[PDB]
């Protein structure tokens, strides 16, 4: 059965290329994008917890404490702390 | 001390207090001239 999958993927990937749009569902509620923002802002803050006192276990063998402390992350921490200005803080 | 999330909880409370003080000064200016 695995060999049948091999012969299938080898054949239709060899067939001539088709135009294929990557156009995904608009049924995402704005609350779905709201908890999407909430998980980003909370994870940036909890990452700051794990930096100052050592609790940061990486998800990469080689991504050190210095590798995640980019100047890009420093600006992301400025956004994460000062987020409550224009976010309507009853929500995230 | 204050590190990470407690900074964001700090800025959220002062930003809330700024909006709160703006709307009560809005009402109290109407009340004093009344």
């Amino acid at each position: 059965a695995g060999k049948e999958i091999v012969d299938w993927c080898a054949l239709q990937l060899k067939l001539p290329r088709l135009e294929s749009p990557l156009k995904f569902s608009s049924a995402v509620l704005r609350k779905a994008a709201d908890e999407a923002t909430g998980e980003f802002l909370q994870y940036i803050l909890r990452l700051d917890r794990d930096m100052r006192e050592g609790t940061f276990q990486s998800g990469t063998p080689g991504l050190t404490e210095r590798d995640v402390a980019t100047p890009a992350y420093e600006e992301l921490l400025e956004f994460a702390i000062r987020a409550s200005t224009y976010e309507d803080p009853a929500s995230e | 001390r204050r590190y990470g999330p407690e900074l964001a909880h700090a800025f959220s409370s002062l930003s809330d207090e700024n909006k709160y003080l703006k709307v009560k000064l809005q009402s109290s200016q109407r009340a004093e001239v009344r």
């Binding site: 200005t85 224009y86 976010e87 309507d88 | 930003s15 700024n18 909006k19 703006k22």
Partner: peptide
């Protein structure tokens, strides 16, 4: 400027 520190300030001033 006058320091638009709300969510209503960037709405009404813009």
């Amino acid at each position: 400027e006058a320091a638009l520190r709300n969510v209503e300030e960037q709405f009404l001033a813009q």
